[PDB]
């Protein structure tokens, strides 16, 4: 709801961060196998 | 923008605080002017951060050396300066106590200790 707490606001922020896609320069590292975010 | 740990050891407390202050002031001014046109100023800021960590380590190390000299001949020491070991090792009997023996046992070993011998074939 509109009423929340800073701590749960921070957790909601982290969930957004983990949804971010994969940077392109990761895919060019030697020995890399990561293609798409899971 | 990188300080050497070797130079910091010779310098004393008052000089170290001046270096720590000027490193932090430099980092504070750099960071605000870094928000625009990032570049070669980025690694200078990174080198500044490692310099701050280096000076903090030397300041703490010298202070603990002074305290250990102060507590050299005192019965109780701060838990920070006490040896860590493990919880079980800390509770273990001291070497002097675990080696203590009864007086009657000592008398028997004094006059009847294990000898060296051989048996012919």
């Amino acid at each position: 709801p509109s009423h929340k707490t800073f701590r749960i606001k921070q957790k909601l922020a982290k969930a957004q961060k983990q949804n971010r896609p994969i940077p392109q320069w990761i895919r060019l590292r030697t020995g890399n196998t990561i293609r798409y975010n899971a | 923008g990188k300080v050497k740990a070797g130079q910091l050891w010779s310098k004393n407390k008052e000089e170290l605080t001046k270096i720590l202050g000027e490193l932090k002031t430099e980092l504070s001014q750099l960071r605000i002017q870094k928000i625009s046109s990032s570049g070669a100023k980025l690694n200078k800021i990174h080198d500044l951060r490692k310099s701050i960590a280096r000076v903090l380590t030397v300041i703490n190390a010298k202070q603990r050396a002074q305290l250990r000299l102060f507590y050299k001949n005192k019965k109780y020491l701060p838990l920070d300066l006490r040896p860590k070991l493990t919880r079980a090792l800390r509770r273990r009997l001291s070497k002097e106590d675990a080696s203590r023996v009864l007086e009657k046992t000592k008398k028997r070993l004094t006059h009847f200790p294990q000898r060296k011998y051989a048996v012919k074939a």
């Binding site: - | 040896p83 070991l85 493990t86 090792l89």
Partner: protein
């Protein structure tokens, strides 16, 4: 709802009425564990997390839990 977030284990298994975690039993000092669920034991056993301090013990043992500094150091 019937279950809320548990502070000790992080799961949404804290009963709102009984105020007891269905997974770890937070108000109780001991962590809930049962021998009829080997899968449950291995989910929360030592080694499933960070191992902040106990990872550093073996190196200190290998050197005898020594104290001091190397001779001639600066």
């Amino acid at each position: 709802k019937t279950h809320g977030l548990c502070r000790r284990c992080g799961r949404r298994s804290l009963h709102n009425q009984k105020k007891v975690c269905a997974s770890c039993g937070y108000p109780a000092a001991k962590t809930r564990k049962y021998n009829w669920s080997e899968k449950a034991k291995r989910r929360k056993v030592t080694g499933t997390g960070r191992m902040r301090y106990l990872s550093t013990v073996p190196r200190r043992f290998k050197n005898g839990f020594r104290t001091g500094v190397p001779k001639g150091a600066r």
